[PDB]
Amino acid sequence: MSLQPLTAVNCGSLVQPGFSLLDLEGDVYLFGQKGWPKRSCPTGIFGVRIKKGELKLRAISFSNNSSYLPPLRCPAIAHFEAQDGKPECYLIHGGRTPNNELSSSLYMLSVDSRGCNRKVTLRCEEKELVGDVPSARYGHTLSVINSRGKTACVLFGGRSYMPPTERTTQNWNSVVDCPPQVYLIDLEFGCCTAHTLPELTDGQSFHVALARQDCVYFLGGHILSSDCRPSRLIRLHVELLLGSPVLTCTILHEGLTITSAIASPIGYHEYIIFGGYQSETQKRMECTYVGLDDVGVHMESREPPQWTSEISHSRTWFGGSLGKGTALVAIPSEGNPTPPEAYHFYQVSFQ
Amino acid sequence: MSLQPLTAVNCGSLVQPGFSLLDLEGDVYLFGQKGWPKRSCPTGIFGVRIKKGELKLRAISFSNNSSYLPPLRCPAIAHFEAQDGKPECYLIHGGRTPNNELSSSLYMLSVDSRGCNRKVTLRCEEKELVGDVPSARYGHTLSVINSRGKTACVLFGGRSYMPPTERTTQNWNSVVDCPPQVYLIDLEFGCCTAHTLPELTDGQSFHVALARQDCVYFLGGHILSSDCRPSRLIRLHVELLLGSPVLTCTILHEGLTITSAIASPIGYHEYIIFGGYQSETQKRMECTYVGLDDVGVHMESREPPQWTSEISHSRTWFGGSLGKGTALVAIPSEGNPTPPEAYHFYQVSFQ
Amino acid sequence: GLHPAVCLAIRVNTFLSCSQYHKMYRTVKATSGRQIFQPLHTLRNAEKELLPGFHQFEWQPALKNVSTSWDVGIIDGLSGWTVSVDDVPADTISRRFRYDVALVSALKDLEEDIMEGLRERALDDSMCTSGFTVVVKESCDGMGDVSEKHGSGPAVPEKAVRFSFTIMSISIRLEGEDDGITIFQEQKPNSELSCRPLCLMFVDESDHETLTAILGPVVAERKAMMESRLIISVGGLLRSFRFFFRGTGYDEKMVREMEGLEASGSTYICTLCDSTRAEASQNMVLHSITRSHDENLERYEIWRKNPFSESADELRDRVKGVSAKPFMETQPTLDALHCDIGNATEFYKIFQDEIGEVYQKPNPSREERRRWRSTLDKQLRKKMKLKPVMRMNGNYARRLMTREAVEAVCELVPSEERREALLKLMDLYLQMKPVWRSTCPSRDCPDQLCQYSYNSQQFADLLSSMFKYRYDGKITNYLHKTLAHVPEIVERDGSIGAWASEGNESGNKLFRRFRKMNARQSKTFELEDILKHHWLYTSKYLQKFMEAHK
Amino acid sequence: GLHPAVCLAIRVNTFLSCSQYHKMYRTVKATSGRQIFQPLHTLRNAEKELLPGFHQFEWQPALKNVSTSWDVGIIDGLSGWTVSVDDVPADTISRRFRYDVALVSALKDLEEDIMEGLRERALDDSMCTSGFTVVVKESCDGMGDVSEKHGSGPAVPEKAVRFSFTIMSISIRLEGEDDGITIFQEQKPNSELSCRPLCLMFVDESDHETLTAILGPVVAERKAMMESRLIISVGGLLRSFRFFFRGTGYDEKMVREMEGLEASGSTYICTLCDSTRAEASQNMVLHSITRSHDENLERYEIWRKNPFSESADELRDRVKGVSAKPFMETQPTLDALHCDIGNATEFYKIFQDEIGEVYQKPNPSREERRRWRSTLDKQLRKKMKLKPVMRMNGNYARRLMTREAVEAVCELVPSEERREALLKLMDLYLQMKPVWRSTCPSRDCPDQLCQYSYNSQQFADLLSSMFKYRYDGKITNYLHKTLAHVPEIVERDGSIGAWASEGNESGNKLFRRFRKMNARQSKTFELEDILKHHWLYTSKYLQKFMEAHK
DNA sequence: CACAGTGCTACAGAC
DNA sequence: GTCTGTAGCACTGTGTAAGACAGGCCAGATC
DNA sequence: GTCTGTAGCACTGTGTAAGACAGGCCAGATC
DNA sequence: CACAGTGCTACAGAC
DNA sequence: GATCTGGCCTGTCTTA
DNA sequence: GATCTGGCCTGTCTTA
Ligand SMILES: [Ca+2]
Ligand SMILES: [Ca+2]
Ligand SMILES: [Ca+2]
Ligand SMILES: [Ca+2]
Ligand SMILES: [Zn+2]
Ligand SMILES: [Zn+2]
């Protein structure tokens, strides 16, 4: 366990408090630049490379085949691994754009060509969705499941803006948890089914999803109605059987209380959960390891890296997982005159 | 006959609107600087080296046995040529202290030691003046003369502050031309004789003096009573006999009208007057050549180096002669924010 | 003594600090009183009438997604940000009036001048109450270098954004035919005295995030507002107004932001036109205005959907510079102020390069260029009495372009053909300037207006001929805008300068004096108080008391 | 109908612009008037009394090198510069009152309070009128970032220098016998309400040549004036004043620069003592004040004349670092304000080093320097409600110095005995601070005063104990000044901080507003009318009216 | 222990 | 029982550019 | 014949930070 | 053809 | 050996 | 080869 400071070098104005790291085929790409894309990099996506403490951001270039994506802030990323037909995919949906609206449109982001010289072109294919569309929402989570042997996806959680009845220009900027109905999205075709369950009383937000082998475990998120941070862990088990995707669920004894957590895969299916927060005021310092198996998910805390007094004292913090048990964290920094760089960074690593 | 534009490199805060340039034994040292000396060079005297357009100023350090000098503004310099026993002399008297005052004390400044690497220690020596002392004054002129064959010195011109009885805190900063009496200063001993002038019914200032072979020519200068800049040039001739240094004088018909002129030596005794102000607004562009022979002064205009429109339009300009027909000029400059260098420079040369 | 309205105006309108005022009141009262002025709590109690959230109103049809409660005063503009640590920060403080309410109050304040314009018209009273049309110039402009307060939180950036509107005109239509018939028209729209602040924020223009969060509700107000007509009981009679909103008052950097255009030195220069740098260098004077809201929106959908699988380099040509979703409609119109500043600083640059011989020796150094600037400014001050400048304020931009200033920098350039050239150029400019900067060129300067196109033609031909070295592949945004789309604009509007940024921009000065003298002052309260006090400064009812009928 | 004096006080005391005022007058007069306020032209001849060059006076013995004319008002301070091109140019605008005249006007304005103090004393007013003693604190402090005006001429720098004074006390001695006897003592000297401007200039502090040219006359009348006693006709009778001039209000840099010292970081730290930097490192609490005017003057004459012929290094050792002839005389005293800011910034730096572990790792990287600043200011915002500064105002020094502010930092330092140590330090500081901050510690805070030497001993011991790594060869000027010469100067002047720069400095705020509201506004007249209007702001006569007698 | 504010809300005093 | 003036509340604005000294070391000239 | 209000005079203060594009070339991966 | 000032001086109008 | 891309660094421009 | 002294850069301090 360890952490070391990172200088953001040039161009640290890109990062905003929510953002997303896409780890695919080795190098990982930052996503969700602050504001609208600048023609320095119109694509919107950046390869990130960390070398000798320096954090360098490179301008990706999309393929001509692709649609271009707005810099969504806090979307649901589900990494879909490599298999037929066309590996490997990052399903991004739907976040909220640099204007204030919620996309509610699923994008599929994939690698395309390389290099020639250390260069990677990408392609974004938006997919049409008929339904029973998912309501436009953000901070929900999405996950990839395979039942015999068909692959589908599970979409649940997240806030949305107040429906257009109660919607008022004084309450316009409020949000509310969208209702608790899971959406099963086939990757292709674009059919989105909406089911609900009696076990799910309420909607959540920022609840970290783990997905393996036709089963999906939602960690405790943040419920806005009763303002609890459930220590109840949630599990659900779906199997797709012609011609319906039948779905079940269970509550668990014990689950974590943390919102806005960072899951960095290390082992086969074993992740290290950093966690953003214990409670509304006080952030979680504790670091935790989470494996999962067919019996169930097993939790073991591991000794957290010793935090510099700065990050121990910082009000808010965020980041993403570079994967391979390696992850990035980010600390806002107040200084005058402006740094200008707004965020100190640290790289964290397991074992 | 040409001008090279000069960069002030670092540290152009030193130079100031009046100042003096001492050319002795090769290199020329700048003298006088804005305000009081700074610890960087406490002596107050800088070596000047001009290389590849760069104007570089270096600290000079005095000998242990020498007095330290205030950065005078507009003193009378007389460069005393090599002979028994002790070349090479610069008689500086008395200028204007940066803390605003007139100093009536006369300094003899000279070379001492080198290098061991390109370093010249100097020595300053006050001289007690037995007199019959000269009233403290500025912009007056002083020049060395030799008669049969002993050597004395001639001091005349300049202004001074209002008589101390008549000086009121409202008229304090006013200044009047001191009375027209010449002071013959023997270098040693300190005897200063004051002498009346039936031919000069008025005092003047800024009048460039050229002294050859026991005769001294005062080129035109600004008179503050009638505010006229006489074209007439005024020659005097000094008779040193035992024990009476009686003094005669004569008016010359026609000469140049100039104030604050720069005399740059070229030939043996041939200096070119480099110009100054002809009127209270227009500044003389024309560059003029002056030989001095026993018959009289031989004066010929010379084709002036073509001035960049900047200096052709400059409100005011000043400088000093580096000798060997080479000299420096300086143009105040504006902008925003500060350049920082308040003065652009140019180097002029003959042939 | 005197009526509390006259007292209030004689406070608001001479800039007296409340504590300053009360100081004075105590003094006049104690000494020889027979107190005259009215005490503070009775000014405050005379206040509630003038601010919004007071006069009752109703909208036909009812407004979309807007509350029907008409009593709401100053609202914190955060507008329900849930301030959950887990979400985007709540950092920015703001206060705003609910737009519709600010309107009806702003306008019922004109009830005086609208009824007196109606009686000037000698127009029917009972009949034709409902046929009105109201044209509102709105403007939004940002302001930097604003220090902040220690305070309890929340942490907030330095720069402050002030969103304001002004009522330009109000007119009538019914029975029919009859064009439409002006009633009231703002006589000096560029005065601080008429600009109505609406939203005050602490935000940097650069971050788009919080700008759209806090101005989002405002936009839904206008857009939901255009369709409805407003019903106000005025002169005893309820009457129905239509509102026509023109945003004209932005600097271009911010226009470019709000409309998703790439900015601001981008190859696609014109906000109103599709020409690149090079194509605008070739043919300067011939262009047709395309860019507007609806097409920019369809343009973005092309940039995103991208149905033709075209490559980026060329895609950007096909959408012609729209990379982002515009969140507001601004009328396709130029701004007068930064046009004047852009051209002024241009000729400052041409002069500068023209001192030194630029076109003989094409490749000058840093040092000759700095020296050229030094002789230029030294001369301008020596003759034109203009100090050197940090940045080009329009006031030095008005004394810079005159024939006198040019003829004082004519002495500088030795070449006697060039003097002819830039001198004649400047006279061309003075001939076309009033065209856009006067309020209504149709009246004040008709003969310059009819000659504009031909006049700009000799101009561009003169640049592309003599000055070409500077203009070959590069032209400032403003030279292009001003040599191309102005005849089209004044044909579409008839006015430019009246729609200029001044009234917003110039009002910032008030904001600064209201963050110091009449502020609260603590982070929480203080915007509320600058805003209220602004609104009073700018109300007519108070200003009528200034002349006191001479 | 107000008396024109009362009205005038309303005007200058509530900061009302002539045009703002006349606006008010017209408005009140038209409505219900019965005009109350008095017109402009009757105020303009109303204050002819309150300005200088009005009341008649004379010195005996007659002053040296000063005219005998007592009617002279605002004088251009250039004071007869011939402004010939050939000479050193006159680049500066200034205006000043002839110092003596400014004085008799200040005092003739205290006539009221000294008569009511004399009666309160029941000291017979008519008898024993000649033995007065007047103690005048003068202060000179400069100000940056003042933008030049386009104007005509001449060219002038941005920075502006405001030279002022204030009457601290006036007392009496005769018949003999007892001490001297206070009559009047300024009750709040640090108020900008009493700071009397005298000379206003546009000058850069850096150039000595112009600062001494313009302030040269002023000094000459001080040092010619110390000798002669004043004769005023006051309370009906001719009475005579002695004046004791203490310049206490200069900041350190300017003290050094008018005293010929080497500013500001030179090896010789103490303006009041000969100690070097490293010499003041080892020993701290023990020092004896030497440096004084006549001594620095003789010391220059040594540095110049140089009879012992030491090399530069040794020579600078022999005069203890006097390299220049001082002109002004300045009292050997310590400014309170910049003392407070210098100590606060030192503790701010100690905090920064205790965030990280400096003594554990002696060689910190630059990135961690910035990182420590960022967590420190994060902390001080979360608790203590403070926001970082570039230069530190003393008001952030007053929130930083307190013990509960050291509490939010004590939570940052992991180490326990450190956390105790700096906490103990800060309590030492709060115990010694009031000594030099409060007006008269001889009464207000006697026990801290008596314990101060022991208390500072305690402190320096603590420093050289746990902090030595920071203090080994280097100590900030003010830490030394405050740990060394304070008990001495409080014993000497009797009190300190009443003499602080505060009362000068504050007044600068007025010079900014008075250069906008009440400026003329053009280069020529602008200093003249700021200065006049300031003087009127300062006068007691008006503030009396503005009290309204409860 | 700088000092004069900065506007509003409560909370007392006044016919 | 309304009217009126003053203390709570937290916080601002005026404190805003230069120089000194120490050590290394590369450039560059004697020798 | 004093008192009073308004036009001459020259000039301010509010317009204040980012990004785009083009060419070089050295670094560094690819073969 | 921004606009409301910024103070003072002359220069007219008013009982 | 020698491309290509990415890099900064610089050299500009245009708006604020 | 190899000093010396400067020279700049860097480095920081201390004041405003
Ligand atoms: Ca702007
Ligand atoms: Ca602005
Ligand atoms: Ca200062
Ligand atoms: Ca100051
Ligand atoms: Zn166009
Ligand atoms: Zn000392």
How far lies A188's CA from each of A110, A145, D120, D338, in Å? Answer: 15, 14, 100, 73
Structure tokens at A1: 């366990």
- Distance CA D535 to C1' G3 in A: 29
* Number of neighbouring beta carbons within 10 Å of residue C143: 17
In a domain, D295, yes or no: no
SS3 A85: coil
Task: Domain count for chain A, please give it.
Answer: 1
CA distance D514 to D526: 10
Residues 6+ apart with CB under 8 A from D497: D336, D436, D437, D438, D439
Structure tokens at C51: 């601010």
User: What b/e readout covers A58-72, taking b as 16+ CB neighbours within 10 angstroms?
Assistant: bebbbbbebbbbbbb
Which residue(s) pair with D1 in the sheet? Answer: none
Q: Are the CB atoms for B318 and B329 separated by under 8 Å?
A: yes
* Number of neighbouring beta carbons within 10 Å of residue A47: 18
How far lies B168's CA from each of A100, B31, C187, C260, D218, in Å? Answer: 74, 32, 58, 70, 11
Q: Are the CB atoms for C162 and C507 separated by under 8 Å?
A: yes
Structure tokens at B210: 């050229």
Residue type, B304: P
- Is A333 within 8 Å of D367 when comparing Cβ atoms? no
Residues 6+ apart with CB under 8 A from C128: C172, C174, C175
In a domain, D306, yes or no: no
- Is D30 within 8 Å of C396 when comparing Cβ atoms? no
Q: Are the CB atoms for C516 and C25 separated by under 8 Å?
A: no
Ligand nearest to the CA of D477: 6
In a domain, D451, yes or no: yes
CA distance B306 to C526: 63
**Helix axis angle, D99-120 relative to D208-225, nearest 10°?**
50
Following DSSP, what letter does each residue of B114-138 receive, concatenated? --SSS--EEEEEEE--BSSPPPP-B
- Is B98 within 8 Å of D209 when comparing Cβ atoms? yes
Residue C144 CA to ligand 2 centre (angstroms): 7
Contacts of C303 in chain A (CB under 8 A): 68
Which residue(s) pair with C230 in the sheet? Answer: C59, C241
- Report which of C23, C50, C48, C51 is spatially closest to residue C37, judged by C-alpha positions: C23
Structure tokens at D275: 């100690």
CA distance D320 to C334: 68
Q: Are the CB atoms for A145 and A126 separated by under 8 Å?
A: no
Residues 6+ apart with CB under 8 A from B71: B31, B32, B33, B34, B35, B36, B37, B44, B97, B98
Pairing of strands A318-323, D75-76: unpaired
Structure tokens at D8: 């005038």
Q: What Rg value do the Cα atoms of chain A yield, rounded?
A: 20
Which residue in C368, C375, C389 is closest to B336 by CB distance? C389
Q: How many residues does chain D have?
A: 550
Alpha helices in D199-318 (DSSP H): 208-225, 252-258, 279-282, 293-305, 312-318
Is the CA virtual torsion C298, C304, C305, C308 positive or negative? positive
**Which residue in this structure is represented by tokens 């314009």?**
C117
Which other chains touch chain A, taking contact as 3+ CB pairs less than 8 Å apart? C, D
Residue type, C539: S
CA distance D207 to D215: 13
Residue type, D222: R
Task: For residue D121, say whether its CB is under 7 Å from any atom of strand H.
Answer: no
Do D158 and D90 lie in a common domain? yes
In a domain, C51, yes or no: no
Q: Are the CB atoms for D264 and D253 separated by under 8 Å?
A: yes
Check CB contact of D1 with chain C, cutoff 8 Å: yes
In a domain, C547, yes or no: no
- Distance CA D150 to C1' F19 in A: 33
SS3 D122: coil
Which residue in A36, A64, A159 is closest to C310 by CB distance? A64
- Distance CA D160 to C1' F16 in A: 13
Q: Which nucleotide is nearest to A9 (CA to C1')?
A: I8
C148 in a labelled binding site: no
* Number of neighbouring beta carbons within 10 Å of residue D60: 10
Do C96 and C110 lie in a common domain? yes
Q: Are the CB atoms for A79 and A20 separated by under 8 Å?
A: no
**Which residue in this structure is represented by tokens 């519709």?**
C100
SS3 D350: helix
Structure tokens at C2: 């005197």
Q: Are the CB atoms for C463 and C498 separated by under 8 Å?
A: no
CA distance A142 to A152: 11
The residue range of the domain holding A335 is 1-351
Q: Are the CB atoms for D321 and D256 separated by under 8 Å?
A: no
CA distance B180 to D120: 65
Do D87 and D28 lie in a common domain? no
Residues 6+ apart with CB under 8 A from B8: B15, B55, B341, B343, B344, B345
Q: Are the CB atoms for B233 and B297 separated by under 8 Å?
A: yes
* Number of neighbouring beta carbons within 10 Å of residue C68: 9
Is the CA virtual torsion A221, A227, A233, A234 positive or negative? negative
Q: Which residue of D15, D37, D387 is the best one to mutate when testing the C interface, meaning the one whose CB has the most C CBs within 10 A? A: D387
CA distance D364 to D444: 44
Do D41 and D163 lie in a common domain? no
SS3 A322: strand
SS3 B227: coil
Q: How many CA atoms lie within 13 A of A274 on its CB side?
A: 31
Look at residues C289, C319, C349 and tell me which one is the last residue of a structural domain.
Answer: C319
- Report which of D395, D400, D484, D505 is spatially closest to residue D436, judged by C-alpha positions: D484
**Torsion angle, alpha carbons of D462, D468, D470, D473, to 10:** 120
Q: How many residues does chain B have?
A: 351
- Residues contacting nucleic strand I by the 7 Å CB criterion are A 9-10, 56-59, 61, 115-119; C 142, 251-254, 264-265, 338, 341-342, 363, 366, 391, 474-478
Q: List the helix and strand counts (H, then E) for chain B.
A: 1, 28
Cis peptide bond N-terminal to B320, omega within 30: no
Contacts of D370 in chain A (CB under 8 A): 335, 339
Do C148 and C120 lie in a common domain? yes
Q: Are the CB atoms for A288 and A312 separated by under 8 Å?
A: no
SS3 B201: coil
**Å between A125 CA and nearest CA of chain D:** 42
CA distance A339 to A333: 8
Residue type, C482: T
Q: What share of chain C is helix, strand, coil (3-state, %, to 5)?
A: 45, 10, 40
Check CB contact of D386 with chain C, cutoff 8 Å: yes
Which other chains touch chain B, taking contact as 3+ CB pairs less than 8 Å apart? C, D
CA distance D292 to D297: 9
Q: Are the CB atoms for B245 and B236 separated by under 8 Å?
A: no
Task: For residue C508, say whether its CB is under 7 Å from any atom of strand H.
Answer: no
Which residue's CA is nearest to the C1' of nucleotide F4? C39
Following DSSP, what letter does each residue of D383-433 receive, concatenated? TTT----SS--HHHHHHHSSHHHHHHHHTT---HHHHHHHHHHHHHHHHHH
Task: Domain count for chain D, please give it.
Answer: 3
Structure tokens at D30: 């038209």
- Distance CA D362 to C1' J12 in A: 15
- Distance CA C295 to C1' F11 in A: 50
- Is C371 within 8 Å of B344 when comparing Cβ atoms? yes
Q: Are the CB atoms for C337 and C395 separated by under 8 Å?
A: no
Check CB contact of D32 with chain B, cutoff 8 Å: no
Q: How far from chain centre, in Å, is Cα A336?
A: 33
* Number of neighbouring beta carbons within 10 Å of residue D458: 17
Contacts of C260 in chain A (CB under 8 A): 36
Residue type, C85: V
Do D127 and D225 lie in a common domain? yes
Structure tokens at D392: 């530190």
Pairing of strands B76-80, B89-93: antiparallel
C178 in a labelled binding site: no
Q: Which nucleotide is nearest to D502 (CA to C1')?
A: E2
In a domain, C550, yes or no: no
Residue B17, phi then psi, degrees to nearest 5: -60, -50
* Number of neighbouring beta carbons within 10 Å of residue A173: 20
Residues 6+ apart with CB under 8 A from C39: C22, C25
**Å between D403 CA and nearest CA of chain A:** 20
Residue D158 CA to ligand 1 centre (angstroms): 26
The residue range of the domain holding D390 is 336-493
Do D412 and D511 lie in a common domain? no
Which residue in D3, D28, D385 is closest to C10 by CB distance? D28
Check CB contact of C492 with chain B, cutoff 8 Å: no
| CA angle A294–A299–A301, rounded 5-degree value | 155
Between B and C, how many residue pairs show a Cβ–Cβ distance under 8 A? 49
Residues 6+ apart with CB under 8 A from D60: D228, D229, D231, D240
CA distance C326 to C256: 9
**Torsion angle, alpha carbons of B89, B95, B101, B107, to 10:** 10
The torsion region of residue D132 among left (phi > 0), alpha (psi -120 to 50) and beta comes to beta
**Å between B245 CA and nearest CA of chain D:** 31
**Å between C380 CA and nearest CA of chain D:** 10
Nucleic acid strand J: bases within 7 A of protein CB: 3-9, 12-16
| CA angle C93–C94–C100, rounded 5-degree value | 160
Q: How many CA atoms lie within 13 A of C489 on its CB side?
A: 27
Q: Is A121 exposed, middle or buried (0-12, 13-18, 19+ CB in 10 A)?
A: middle
- Is B36 within 8 Å of D260 when comparing Cβ atoms? yes
Residue C348 CA to ligand 1 centre (angstroms): 21
In a domain, C147, yes or no: yes
Following DSSP, what letter does each residue of A227-256 receive, concatenated? -------EEEEEEEETTEEEEEEEE-S---
- Is C152 within 8 Å of D546 when comparing Cβ atoms? no
**Torsion angle, alpha carbons of D59, D60, D61, D63, to 10:** 0
Which residue's CA is nearest to the C1' of nucleotide J16? D253
Q: How many CA atoms lie within 13 A of B54 on its CB side?
A: 9
Residues 6+ apart with CB under 8 A from B103: B70, B72, B93, B94, B95, B96, B97, B136
How far lies C460's CA from each of C272, C286, C398, in Å? Answer: 19, 11, 22
Residues 6+ apart with CB under 8 A from C259: C271, C291, C293, C296, C322, C326, C328, C330
Do D368 and D234 lie in a common domain? no
Structure tokens at D79: 């004071």
Q: Which nucleotide is nearest to C520 (CA to C1')?
A: E6
Q: Which residue of A313, A316, A336 is the best one to mutate when testing the D interface, meaning the one whose CB has the most D CBs within 10 A? A: A313
Extract the runs of DSSP E, i.e. beta strands, from C344-429: none
Which residue's CA is nearest to the C1' of nucleotide I16? C253
Between A and D, how many residue pairs show a Cβ–Cβ distance under 8 A? 48
CA distance D479 to D494: 21
Check CB contact of D462 with chain C, cutoff 8 Å: no
Which residue(s) pair with A346 in the sheet? Answer: A5, A329
**Which residue in this structure is represented by tokens 């290099």?**
A115
Is the CA virtual torsion C151, C153, C155, C160 positive or negative? negative
**Å between D340 CA and nearest CA of chain C:** 20
CA distance C428 to C104: 45
CA distance D310 to D308: 6
Residue B110, phi then psi, degrees to nearest 5: -160, 175
Which residue in B18, B170, B172 is closest to D88 by CB distance? B18
3-state SS record for C499-512: HCCHHHHCHHHHHH
Do D406 and D536 lie in a common domain? no
Q: How far from chain centre, in Å, is Cα A263?
A: 9
Residues 6+ apart with CB under 8 A from D269: D275, D276, D277, D280, D475, D477, D480, D481
CA distance D147 to D157: 9
Q: Which nucleotide is nearest to C398 (CA to C1')?
A: H1
CA distance B166 to D64: 10
In a domain, D259, yes or no: no
- Is C382 within 8 Å of B344 when comparing Cβ atoms? no
* Entry resolution (Å): 3.7
Do C196 and C238 lie in a common domain? yes
Residue C347 CA to ligand 5 centre (angstroms): 21
